[PDB]
Design a protein around this nucleic acid. Structure first.
Lengths: 388, 382, 363
RNA sequence: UUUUUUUUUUUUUUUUUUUUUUUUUUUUUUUUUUUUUUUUUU
């Protein structure tokens, strides 16, 4: 009877989820040039890191070059850098041409030594690098200038530095596509952790100017974020020890999971986990059936789930908290009242209904935390603890 | 006994739904010309986009050409544009001739392969382009005019632009055939989202005037909506990686689903999901049995169901509320009273039964604010 | 119904735990040189200890050498030094090159220009340290020990001085002295440890700092520390001192888990089923079962920098934790001296949890 | 040795009523924003 309705709501939610898309939908691939580490020697590499930092710093280079540069910069992790990028990079939007650098002996950019893309290629590069320097008022990547010039000579220094720069990319992911302004507070909080824990090599601490330029590149490019989230999923999978580089990524992951799905987890933490005596309220009769459908749906979305927002994954929209709005408005009302850390959150969403929120705020709070709906005069004594 | 009646109501509802329609019903075909990207090279692709934007901007081009132009414009997604159209286009009203000229040496219009015989064609195109410019008082497609003028030089610029225009077509679809006036609030709200989220490249922003001209073309052509809904179903299917183009479409999809079937879900959301004490209203019984049969029917109709309105699908009538108006007038009465966002939707139909709707409302008020459906602090909730 | 939600919270937490990592993750491997104990002679063992103490004391010596030194120093336990390191060392970031010469003619920094680089390193080490030698009372630093019994007495004494550090190196790398002395008192009072080999505060601080700042070393240490801890073996003097230190080292840097579990939660004060804590208890349940699933590394998660450690970190059950600290501080005289000035603590719940126990000797 | 009397009788056809008449396009919401380490002793 009633059972059919609930099952039908669930049916709608899962209808047409299935099936495999026709190949005709395959979109025009965008060509990106990625210069990639040609040998496992610090001589070739350190210079290439400097080049890549500067490509991303450049006002003068085209966006197509800049994406490819960012891919160079955040593939320095690998034992075999070019192979790591080419083999894991898996998105239809973008078609890579991979160039293994020829020892990178021509200052900051790299040239085709024998077969020539063009003789002016180096100038397209020289222009890029000059514009980069000039527009940034001389500033090298690191906050203390000696580090910008370093030209490091051994594996030990290399790994110290590379781990440092990589960690500074991965600090960004956490907010680049969830709140790319307001960012500084959080990204500095995460910086402090890695340094205080001695996980990253502090000589290589990177300038706000460089970090903002990279944060913006991440916000505005899908193709980059796709590679990042591909790697972020791959290294999140268990059953491996990690040394310093991959370890910092994995560590950051524990902050990066669920990010930009605030509302979903918020309904779970506040309101739902809370289970006040008022859950069966008429609205809650349906909204609860909604949440059930949502949870089973979330399960079905599967391996991508922890990072849907970073992936721009459309399924994400369905998961968005506006989907159960009566229960959610009550979930903010309870959550704000009960958890001291919450409420600091940005609560301006259209699906908030004041009347339902007020009940959630007061129903819990005037309830002294839902004292009445808890399940030697235990009840009464707990009055002191409420302090209101 | 009583069981037979319930089964019989269901039987009536499903009766003669089955079987396969005779091929003799094959309709008089409309012949339409679709100019389609001949090569994956930016020179041709930019020029062809300008051609197509102008076809849609024109007062002077014929409707048959304009539909074919709109199909050019919203197939710009494809790596092989001709293949994308030919392979997804699947509707027996409209029969395409696909012209895949890549040479684009014909200025504003396409080149004509017949040469001197195409001379009439080329001047028809010229008239179309002139009339487009003149009728629009000089306004190019984009809101900031430098963009409208800008000939593009790379893949990067191309994809930025194409993604941008495509997104601007797909924003329309959700309301073009559900409420083609009153549209602005919703379509701007969706515009704001895609831009704020940095999903599409704002240098390419398309003018209100052009978008209204195209929205109207979409409302008044079935053939265009058929191709759009074909694509909208195809890319809604899961288990595929997407590039930026298909991703924007898919994202829009999540707003486009259920559109123009307001009433069907409203009985589900309000009244039904609510499980109010009055579900046991004696009168109600037969209507509840009705709605149940409808919901299971809806399920059985299957793949087209999320976009039934856009497809003009006949079955839609049945799913129409007003097919169960007693349980419906109560469902509006509950819904509008209990959900703060509802009631702002214009619900004024002749099938509404005031007394029963007020029973729905009173359901709230006489419920002591819905205490009736409590499911000793069941009235402690000012 | 409600049961599904609790199960779902748990599902989210354990989702993506599974699977095996793509080779593409492999980071650029660092070469480290390890001089390693040549054979069963006190001659080699003492000289190598002196070499290693000086490598750590050196102002001029490279990080790559220093780590390798540390690995020599804390492989002294084994019957076959170089084999013990090579066979237990199981970390991808580092590739060890082992030198295991019985020749031992080359004290601390021996040749295989390089030899003069080594000489500069050793000179700079001596000079910068103002001659201050490994052991606290000078004759002990100077004295060659020549036979098995004296050798193992000495080696186990230096090694125990390394292993006293692990207990705080990655959890409180300053303010260390109090703890390391407290552990020293135990081993001496129990007559396990030979005070002739007392090691100088200058050297101990230099080594403590090396442990804090090098991950690769700590990885190997914790690998060994876990391996020997595993059951069904008797230990004689050397391994016994490690095992003894282990009883301070276990659960380290998981204070919040054990503390909120032991104090507050296991105490189960009749305010346990708070209308606000229901989700948190469900949280902690999920946490405990998760902890189980993480398995063998669990007693040393923090020391291993193990990622999931983050999930176990105490901010994960904040309501219960704030309340439980409020109980713990009230009931246990020794607690509360533990620094809980953290941003995630809930004042209101601490005032309540504290009150619930200390209402009137309420507990 | 055995012991009586036995059937049938009524009623019976047909009669009413039986087309239809209402209602049924749509219209609201829908991106993102918080905290995520560490510091007792045995």
């Amino acid at each position: 009877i009633f059972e059919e309705a609930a099952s039908f709501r669930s049916y709608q939610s899962k209808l047409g989820r299935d099936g495999r898309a026709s190949a005709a939908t395959a979109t025009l691939t965008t060509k990106i040039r990625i210069f990639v580490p040609a040998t496992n020697s610090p001589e070739l590499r350190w210079e290439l890191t400097l080049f890549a930092l500067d490509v991303i710093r450049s006002p003068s280079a085209a966006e197509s070059m800049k994406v490819g540069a960012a891919f160079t910069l955040i593939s320095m992790y690998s034992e075999r850098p070019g192979a790591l990028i080419r083999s894991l990079l898996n998105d239809p939007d973008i078609e890579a041409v991979i160039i293994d650098v020829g020892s990178m002996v021509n200052g900051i950019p790299v040239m085709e030594r024998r077969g020539d893309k063009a003789q002016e290629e180096m100038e397209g590069l020289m222009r890029i690098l000059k514009t980069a320097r000039d527009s940034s008022k001389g500033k090298t990547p690191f906050v203390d200038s000696r580090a910008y010039g370093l030209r490091i000579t051994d594996m030990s220094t290399l790994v110290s530095a590379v781990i440092t720069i990589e960690a500074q990319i991965w600090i960004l992911i956490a907010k680049a596509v969830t709140a790319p302004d307001t960012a500084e507070e959080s990204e500095t909080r995460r910086w402090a952790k890695y340094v205080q824990q001695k996980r990253v090599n502090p000589f290589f601490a990177l300038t706000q100017q460089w970090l903002t330029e990279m944060r913006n590149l991440l916000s505005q490019s899908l193709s980059v974020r796709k590679f990042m989230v591909e790697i972020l999923i791959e290294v999140k999978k268990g059953g491996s020890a990690k040394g310093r580089a991959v370890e910092i990524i994995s560590d950051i992951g524990n902050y990066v999971e669920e990010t930009g799905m605030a509302g979903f987890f918020a309904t779970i933490r506040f309101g739902l986990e809370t289970r006040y005596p008022a859950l069966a309220l008429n609205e809650f009769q349906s909204d609860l059936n909604t949440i059930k459908s949502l949870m089973l749906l979330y399960r079905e979305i599967g391996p991508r789930a922890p990072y849907m927002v970073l992936l721009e994954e459309s399924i994400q929209t369905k998961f968005a908290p506006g989907g159960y709005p009566l229960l959610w408005s009550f979930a903010m009302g309870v959550a704000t009242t009960i958890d001291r850390s919450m409420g600091a959150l940005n609560i301006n969403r259209g699906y908030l209904e004041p009347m339902y929120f007020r009940l959630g705020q007061k129903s819990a709070r005037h309830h002294a935390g839902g004292i009445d709906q808890n399940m030697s005069d235990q009840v009464a004594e707990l009055a002191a603890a409420v302090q209101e």
